[PDB]
Design an enzyme around this catalytic site. Structure first.
Site, PDB file in Angstrom:
ATOM      1  N   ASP A 250      -7.069  -5.654  -6.053  1.00 28.74           N
ATOM      2  CA  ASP A 250      -6.854  -5.892  -4.627  1.00 28.74           C
ATOM      3  C   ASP A 250      -6.225  -4.690  -3.943  1.00 28.74           C
ATOM      4  O   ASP A 250      -5.082  -4.325  -4.224  1.00 28.74           O
ATOM      5  CB  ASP A 250      -5.980  -7.145  -4.447  1.00 28.74           C
ATOM      6  CG  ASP A 250      -5.828  -7.547  -2.999  1.00 28.74           C
ATOM      7  OD1 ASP A 250      -6.733  -8.239  -2.490  1.00 28.74           O
ATOM      8  OD2 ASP A 250      -4.811  -7.166  -2.382  1.00 28.74           O
TER       9      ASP A 250
ATOM     10  N   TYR B 215      -2.906   0.305   2.426  1.00 30.13           N
ATOM     11  CA  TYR B 215      -2.135   0.668   1.241  1.00 30.13           C
ATOM     12  C   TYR B 215      -2.133   2.163   0.979  1.00 30.13           C
ATOM     13  O   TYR B 215      -1.351   2.648   0.164  1.00 30.13           O
ATOM     14  CB  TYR B 215      -2.615  -0.094   0.002  1.00 30.13           C
ATOM     15  CG  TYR B 215      -2.587  -1.595   0.133  1.00 30.13           C
ATOM     16  CD1 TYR B 215      -1.942  -2.220   1.209  1.00 30.13           C
ATOM     17  CD2 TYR B 215      -3.188  -2.397  -0.833  1.00 30.13           C
ATOM     18  CE1 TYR B 215      -1.928  -3.607   1.327  1.00 30.13           C
ATOM     19  CE2 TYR B 215      -3.174  -3.777  -0.726  1.00 30.13           C
ATOM     20  CZ  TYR B 215      -2.552  -4.376   0.357  1.00 30.13           C
ATOM     21  OH  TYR B 215      -2.557  -5.750   0.457  1.00 30.13           O
TER      22      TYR B 215
ATOM     23  N   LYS C  18      -9.540  -4.319   2.718  1.00 28.76           N
ATOM     24  CA  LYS C  18      -9.180  -5.097   3.901  1.00 28.76           C
ATOM     25  C   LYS C  18      -9.195  -4.239   5.141  1.00 28.76           C
ATOM     26  O   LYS C  18      -8.762  -3.077   5.128  1.00 28.76           O
ATOM     27  CB  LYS C  18      -7.786  -5.723   3.762  1.00 28.76           C
ATOM     28  CG  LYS C  18      -7.499  -6.393   2.426  1.00 28.76           C
ATOM     29  CD  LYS C  18      -6.233  -7.229   2.465  1.00 28.76           C
ATOM     30  CE  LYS C  18      -5.865  -7.729   1.075  1.00 28.76           C
ATOM     31  NZ  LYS C  18      -5.284  -6.669   0.190  1.00 28.76           N
TER      32      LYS C  18
ATOM     33  N   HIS D 238      -7.399  -8.302   7.219  1.00 27.89           N
ATOM     34  CA  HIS D 238      -6.058  -8.282   6.597  1.00 27.89           C
ATOM     35  C   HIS D 238      -5.089  -9.283   7.234  1.00 27.89           C
ATOM     36  O   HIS D 238      -4.270  -9.898   6.541  1.00 27.89           O
ATOM     37  CB  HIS D 238      -5.472  -6.867   6.679  1.00 27.89           C
ATOM     38  CG  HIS D 238      -4.431  -6.555   5.641  1.00 27.89           C
ATOM     39  ND1 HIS D 238      -4.351  -5.320   5.029  1.00 27.89           N
ATOM     40  CD2 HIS D 238      -3.411  -7.293   5.133  1.00 27.89           C
ATOM     41  CE1 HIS D 238      -3.335  -5.316   4.182  1.00 27.89           C
ATOM     42  NE2 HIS D 238      -2.747  -6.499   4.225  1.00 27.89           N
TER      43      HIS D 238
HETATM   44  N1  LIG Z   1      -2.974  -9.872   2.481  1.00 24.37           N
HETATM   45  C1  LIG Z   1      -1.705  -9.490   2.677  1.00 24.37           C
HETATM   46  O1  LIG Z   1      -1.187  -9.445   3.786  1.00 24.37           O
HETATM   47  C2  LIG Z   1      -0.874  -9.167   1.474  1.00 24.37           C
HETATM   48  C3  LIG Z   1       0.516  -9.209   1.545  1.00 24.37           C
HETATM   49  C4  LIG Z   1       1.266  -8.933   0.405  1.00 24.37           C
HETATM   50  C5  LIG Z   1       0.604  -8.636  -0.782  1.00 24.37           C
HETATM   51  N2  LIG Z   1      -0.751  -8.579  -0.830  1.00 24.37           N
HETATM   52  C6  LIG Z   1      -1.465  -8.247  -2.081  1.00 24.37           C
HETATM   53  O2  LIG Z   1      -0.927  -9.010  -3.171  1.00 24.37           O
HETATM   54  C7  LIG Z   1      -0.366  -8.143  -4.159  1.00 24.37           C
HETATM   55  C8  LIG Z   1       0.809  -8.812  -4.866  1.00 24.37           C
HETATM   56  O3  LIG Z   1       1.816  -9.263  -3.949  1.00 24.37           O
HETATM   57  P1  LIG Z   1       3.211  -8.467  -3.775  1.00 24.37           P
HETATM   58  O4  LIG Z   1       2.914  -7.010  -3.537  1.00 24.37           O
HETATM   59  O5  LIG Z   1       3.999  -9.226  -2.747  1.00 24.37           O
HETATM   60  O6  LIG Z   1       3.935  -8.535  -5.214  1.00 24.37           O
HETATM   61  P2  LIG Z   1       4.099  -9.722  -6.304  1.00 24.37           P
HETATM   62  O7  LIG Z   1       2.808  -9.880  -7.050  1.00 24.37           O
HETATM   63  O8  LIG Z   1       4.777 -10.908  -5.678  1.00 24.37           O
HETATM   64  O9  LIG Z   1       5.110  -8.968  -7.297  1.00 24.37           O
HETATM   65  C9  LIG Z   1       6.466  -8.764  -6.891  1.00 24.37           C
HETATM   66  C10 LIG Z   1       7.181  -7.907  -7.915  1.00 24.37           C
HETATM   67  O10 LIG Z   1       7.166  -8.584  -9.162  1.00 24.37           O
HETATM   68  C11 LIG Z   1       7.363  -7.603 -10.182  1.00 24.37           C
HETATM   69  N3  LIG Z   1       6.719  -8.123 -11.398  1.00 24.37           N
HETATM   70  C12 LIG Z   1       5.409  -8.119 -11.690  1.00 24.37           C
HETATM   71  N4  LIG Z   1       5.215  -8.710 -12.886  1.00 24.37           N
HETATM   72  C13 LIG Z   1       6.435  -9.111 -13.326  1.00 24.37           C
HETATM   73  C14 LIG Z   1       6.848  -9.759 -14.478  1.00 24.37           C
HETATM   74  N5  LIG Z   1       5.961 -10.137 -15.421  1.00 24.37           N
HETATM   75  N6  LIG Z   1       8.159 -10.025 -14.663  1.00 24.37           N
HETATM   76  C15 LIG Z   1       9.205  -9.675 -13.712  1.00 24.37           C
HETATM   77  N7  LIG Z   1       8.701  -8.995 -12.532  1.00 24.37           N
HETATM   78  C16 LIG Z   1       7.375  -8.739 -12.379  1.00 24.37           C
HETATM   79  C17 LIG Z   1       6.723  -6.321  -9.667  1.00 24.37           C
HETATM   80  O11 LIG Z   1       7.598  -5.216  -9.884  1.00 24.37           O
HETATM   81  P3  LIG Z   1       7.148  -4.040 -10.904  1.00 24.37           P
HETATM   82  O12 LIG Z   1       6.043  -3.275 -10.197  1.00 24.37           O
HETATM   83  O13 LIG Z   1       8.427  -3.228 -11.048  1.00 24.37           O
HETATM   84  O14 LIG Z   1       6.678  -4.721 -12.156  1.00 24.37           O
HETATM   85  C18 LIG Z   1       6.486  -6.577  -8.182  1.00 24.37           C
HETATM   86  O15 LIG Z   1       6.999  -5.551  -7.329  1.00 24.37           O
HETATM   87  C19 LIG Z   1      -0.073  -6.869  -3.368  1.00 24.37           C
HETATM   88  O16 LIG Z   1       0.134  -5.716  -4.196  1.00 24.37           O
HETATM   89  C20 LIG Z   1      -1.303  -6.784  -2.494  1.00 24.37           C
HETATM   90  O17 LIG Z   1      -2.404  -6.392  -3.325  1.00 24.37           O
HETATM   91  C21 LIG Z   1      -1.480  -8.843   0.264  1.00 24.37           C
END
Ligand SMILES: NC(=O)c1ccc[n+]([C@@H]2O[C@H](COP(=O)([O-])OP(=O)(O)OC[C@H]3O[C@@H](n4cnc5c(N)ncnc54)[C@H](OP(=O)(O)O)[C@@H]3O)[C@@H](O)[C@H]2O)c1
Length: 312
Positions: free
Chosen positions: A50, A55, A84, A117
């Site tokens: 994704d 980004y 997006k 997005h």
């Molecule tokens: N459409 C939209 O508006 C929108 C908004 C937000 C996000 N997104 C998409 O969704 C993706 C994921 O959402 P998000 O960026 O909010 O992050 P998330 O998936 O909620 O992850 C949050 C944090 O969790 C940590 N993490 C990952 N695996 C872990 C584990 N096994 N144990 C403990 N911590 C862990 C990561 O840090 P580390 O990197 O240090 O492991 C990461 O920074 C984004 O990267 C993007 O692709 C889209």
């Protein structure tokens, strides 16, 4: 154990892997890191990747994909790549060129999925813009017909914003998905039910509680992965709170993203397919719902098309 290659059929006949790799990292992270970690994600077994114009990583993510194709690890058809349309490109004449630019950045012929997005239109360049998103959607439809995107969808839409598209005269393609903030503190139950009723997949972002970026997220907000219920379930299953949070979504029929830029955690996250939660576990996680969206800034809440006022 589940198959790592589990996918669901989208309403246009294409298939989406139910676990996706989140590629956003904040600007303080060097651009080159996305290349390294996307390759690691593919190595670990992620196939759904994704990205987004926002980004500023499409070149690096694209190269990672092409590097893993070139070395024989995967074929292009094995990868499900999302980008997006950013909110300054909602005016219909800007939509196809935005996709073309995303494709050229990634050096790919097509994206598997292209999303709006956010419904919160911003002035081309930039403050707030007023754009009829049905016109944006028509331009998205033309991108599907031309083969630039295999599938098209939306992100951050509420029920009524979805209904505006679904009820559009001369609609050609329903959105295949609505990618939204979704985790045990904000589980989107009613929106999920609605999406399911319309053959629209709900895709969860911030499924691990978000990256808690100071631009967008209150540091006071409880940290999802510190939740005592998730931690107790992690102890019960000898897993991690992250794995409990991901598994929860899979068992609800939600497609789930997980961002990690850490090699160990990238590999850990694919273990979501390797255990199950019971009905009682799922009930315990459902009890956590508390109307907490981590993305919570004046910049969103003041926007005319902010999705969070309505019940769902
Ligand atoms: N459409 C939209 O508006 C929108 C908004 C937000 C996000 N997104 C998409 O969704 C993706 C994921 O959402 P998000 O960026 O909010 O992050 P998330 O998936 O909620 O992850 C949050 C944090 O969790 C940590 N993490 C990952 N695996 C872990 C584990 N096994 N144990 C403990 N911590 C862990 C990561 O840090 P580390 O990197 O240090 O492991 C990461 O920074 C984004 O990267 C993007 O692709 C889209």
């Amino acid at each position: 154990m589940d198959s790592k290659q589990q996918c669901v059929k989208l309403n246009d006949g294409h298939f989406m892997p139910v676990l996706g790799f989140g590629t956003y990292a904040p600007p303080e992270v060097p651009r080159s890191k996305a290349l390294e970690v996307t390759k690691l994600a593919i190595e670990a077994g992620f196939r759904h990747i994704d990205s987004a114009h926002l980004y500023n990583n499409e070149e690096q993510v694209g190269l990672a994909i092409r590097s893993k194709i070139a070395d024989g690890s995967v074929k292009r058809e094995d990868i499900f790549y999302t980008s997006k349309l950013w909110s300054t490109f909602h005016r219909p004449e800007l939509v196809r060129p935005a996709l073309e630019n995303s494709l050229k950045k990634a050096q790919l012929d097509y994206v598997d999925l292209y999303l709006i997005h956010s419904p919160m239109s911003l002035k081309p360049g930039e403050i707030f813009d007023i754009v009829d998103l049905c016109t944006t959607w028509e331009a998205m439809e033309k991108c599907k017909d031309a083969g630039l995107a295999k599938s098209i969808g939306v992100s951050n839409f509420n029920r009524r914003q979805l209904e505006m598209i679904l009820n559009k005269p001369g609609l050609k393609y329903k959105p295949v998905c609505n990618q939204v903030e979704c985790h045990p503190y904000f589980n989107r139950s009613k929106l999920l039910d609605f999406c399911k009723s319309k053959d629209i997949v709900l895709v969860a972002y911030s499924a691990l509680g978000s990256q808690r970026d100071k631009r967008w997220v209150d540091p006071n907000s409880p940290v999802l992965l510190e939740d005592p219920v998730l931690c107790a379930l992690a102890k019960k299953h000898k897993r991690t709170p992250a794995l409990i949070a991901l598994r929860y979504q899979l068992q609800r029929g939600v497609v789930v993203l997980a961002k990690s830029y850490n090699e160990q955690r990238i590999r850990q996250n694919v273990q979501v397919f390797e255990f199950q939660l019971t009905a009682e576990d799922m009930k315990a996680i459902d009890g956590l719902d508390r109307n907490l969206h981590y993305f919570n800034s004046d910049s969103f809440a003041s926007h005319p098309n902010y999705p969070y006022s309505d019940e769902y």
